[PDB]
Amino acid sequence: NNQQNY
Amino acid sequence: NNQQNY
Amino acid sequence: NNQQNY
Amino acid sequence: NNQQNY
Amino acid sequence: NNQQNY
Amino acid sequence: NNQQNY
Amino acid sequence: NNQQNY
Amino acid sequence: NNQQNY
Amino acid sequence: NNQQNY
Amino acid sequence: NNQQNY
Amino acid sequence: NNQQNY
Amino acid sequence: NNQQNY
């Protein structure tokens, strides 16, 4: 699973 | 699993 | 931010 | 930030 | 920041 | 598992 | 920062 | 497991 | 900073 | 396991 | 800083 | 295990 917070 | 906080 | 992998 | 891998 | 690997 | 906090 | 590997 | 705090 | 390897 | 605090 | 290897 | 505090 992937979570990216820019 | 991956979490990246920029 | 929160990521939980059960 | 929080990442928990159970 | 917190990372816990059970 | 990977957590990166920039 | 905290990393715990059980 | 990997945690990097920049 | 804290790293614990059980 | 790896923890780097820059 | 703290590193404990059990 | 590795912990580096720069």
Next chain:
Amino acid sequence: NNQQNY
């Protein structure tokens, strides 16, 4: 700094 190797 503290390193304990049990």
Next chain:
Amino acid sequence: NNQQNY
């Protein structure tokens, strides 16, 4: 195990 405090 390795701990380096710069």
Next chain:
Amino acid sequence: NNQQNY
């Protein structure tokens, strides 16, 4: 600084 090798 403290290093204990049990």
Next chain:
Amino acid sequence: NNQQNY
């Protein structure tokens, strides 16, 4: 085991 305090 290795601990270096610069």
Next chain:
Amino acid sequence: NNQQNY
């Protein structure tokens, strides 16, 4: 500084 080798 303290180093104890049991």
Next chain:
Amino acid sequence: NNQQNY
């Protein structure tokens, strides 16, 4: 085991 205090 190695402890170096610079």
